[PDB]
Amino acid sequence: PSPLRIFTAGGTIDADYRLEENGLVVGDPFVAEVLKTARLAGAVSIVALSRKDSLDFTEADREAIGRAVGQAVEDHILLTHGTDTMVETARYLGGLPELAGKTVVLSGAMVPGRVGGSDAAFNIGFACAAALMLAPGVYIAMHGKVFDPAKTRKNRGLGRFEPI
Amino acid sequence: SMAVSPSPLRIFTAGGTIDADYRLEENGLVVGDPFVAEVLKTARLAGAVSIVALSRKDSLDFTEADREAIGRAVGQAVEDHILLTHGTDTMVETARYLGGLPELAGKTVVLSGAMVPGRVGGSDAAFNIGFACAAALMLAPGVYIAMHGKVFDPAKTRKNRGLGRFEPI
Amino acid sequence: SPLRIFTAGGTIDADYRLEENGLVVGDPFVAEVLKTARLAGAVSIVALSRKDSLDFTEADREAIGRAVGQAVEDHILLTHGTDTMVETARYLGGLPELAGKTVVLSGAMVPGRVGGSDAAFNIGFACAAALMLAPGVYIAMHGKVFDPAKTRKNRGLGRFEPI
Amino acid sequence: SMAVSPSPLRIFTAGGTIDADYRLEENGLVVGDPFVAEVLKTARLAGAVSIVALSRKDSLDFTEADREAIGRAVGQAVEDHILLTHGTDTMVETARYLGGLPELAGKTVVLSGAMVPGRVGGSDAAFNIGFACAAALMLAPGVYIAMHGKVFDPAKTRKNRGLGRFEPID
Ligand SMILES: N[C@@H](CC(=O)O)C(=O)O
Ligand SMILES: N[C@@H](CC(=O)O)C(=O)O
């Protein structure tokens, strides 16, 4: 496979329990736990960007994410991210000429990887393949399919991303 | 019409380490229920995936006749995107055989599995199932092995039993 | 001897809900642990509450006492939040109608449905305690037995400790 | 002085299904590292439990010699509360053997294990470890099997291989 760069921006996928909080915080990146047992053949590296809930991201934050992705010489990019503003980040990156040669896939999980019954590990496998296999562009890989960010919204009534 | 989600992927299960499960009776692992069905239960899929049983043999005990029946089931599917979960010991044999079937020419057919049973701690299974479902949807028509976060050409691949990996010839 | 298990909620039973963007008190985790415990003996589970123990009032503890008093069983396990486990245990230890019973409170500092949880160990340990201890009221946590009158939850330490 | 938590329990490990783990070399389960150590890492214990490896043979491979070596290790512990994790197939034989040693008269010695490996989904292991730790602390001196959420008298217990359960002899 082509070299894959993974950026971690936080989200439910990375949530972990803290006694002090009496609840979940955004913890260490769950993608690193999945890849530790994936027996990878190829070149993959993981970079920490942010440990935020995506609800708390500003236009400034999205701009910083785009410049960070442009710092990678890799042409295949996975960004793990909260689902609540995944569409906004993806649309923002889709507009950056500097990223036009890259395949950039955003993913995450509706249930924390550290909670029972999580979609995280499946989503990570699916999104790593998507980052390696899709043509240049910006995509959301969730629910075992590929979404066009310009034509996607998160439907909270369904608990899924859906096309517009 | 209101939007209908397609179900473009079909999964077949042929057993293998991925599906092993502990049985008191035997004091060890047997080939059990398909682990791929457990991963997809919590994957919050937009579509559905039809999962069909073909076999629960060890991939070491496959004959001509077993490989031929897998070819018919895959050939008869309406879907053009197919994942076959399978033992790793003879995954190359099965993949090479399916490569020779003109009836599969318009289909993307991916074989995958796991070096560690899904029901054992520290398993590659869930990652490999996500990666392989993506590969089955995104690769051009052909027959592939998706393992170790990469895609292998069956004609140019062997299983290294001692090293626990697929590798190039 | 027959064991009766009451569930009053707590961290042990927390589960994720998409609606909440976080944890809520979910179904009792003790039922998931006992499902695979291959039990030989008579055990039954009753739902009492799904609160964070922080929201428990005197009336809440009173309802819990009457429910335990409805059980003919002499071996009782109560799963519960850790934050007011001492208050509930002290209240039950004052009820003459429960004097013949061994009543053990337990729970977990990490939710059973979160990785790295003490829940399953705590449930095994507490079920043994409920069956093996003399009549009384006890907290079983950290692999030992606490006397409620002489115990506090030290949030700085993250453990129950003697006073 | 400031309060010191005692460590009144010692754990010995003799193998068994509880400790099984998958090995690619073998294309199956072997007796791996002691699973009790994994349970106690996340148990938030007040004390500290010393865990001592005695054996990794399958319980069916135990000799008289092996049982004797286990009795000498248990007898030499200073702790009066002892848990021995073990295979279920010959747990009764090891338990009966220990029950005959005068050296163990003042100790509460509990044998436990699991019908399903701790590293396999749906395992009884973690429950059984919590139960057995409590049993080793709370039971009077003697030798016991703690399985299925109850305490067995080794002299009046058999392993039902078919049902994967310990049962009384009535
Ligand atoms: N509030 C979370 C929701 C999620 O990731 O599913 C986030 O956007 O970070
Ligand atoms: N806040 C929780 C803490 C715990 O159970 O550990 C409760 O009392 O419900």
Author numbering:
A (entry chain C): 5 to 168
B (entry chain D): 0 to 168
C (entry chain B): 6 to 168
D (entry chain A): 0 to 169
Question: What sentences appear in the manuscript?
Answer:
L‐Asparaginases (ASNases) catalyze the hydrolysis of L‐Asn to L‐Asp and ammonia. In contrast, the chain of ASNase from Rhodospirillum rubrum, reported here and referred to as RrA, consists of only 172 amino acid residues. RrA is homologous to the N‐terminal domain of typical bacterial class 1 ASNases and exhibits millimolar affinity for L‐Asn. Crystal structures of the wild‐type RrA, both with and without bound L‐Asp, as well as structures of several RrA mutants, reveal topologically unique tetramers.
Another residue that was mutated in order to assess its importance for the catalytic activity was Lys19. This residue is highly conserved in scASNases but not in typical class 1 ASNases. We probed the importance of this residue by mutating it to L‐Ala, L‐Glu, and L‐Gln. In some cases, orthorhombic crystals with a doubled c axis were obtained, belonging to space group P212121. The a. u. for these crystals contained a complete tetramer. The kinetic data, even when reduced to approximate turnover numbers, demonstrate that Lys19 plays an important role during catalysis and its mutation reduces the rate of catalysis by two or more orders of magnitude. It appears that Lys19 may play a comparable function to Tyr21, each being responsible for both stabilizing the tetramer and for supporting proton transfer.
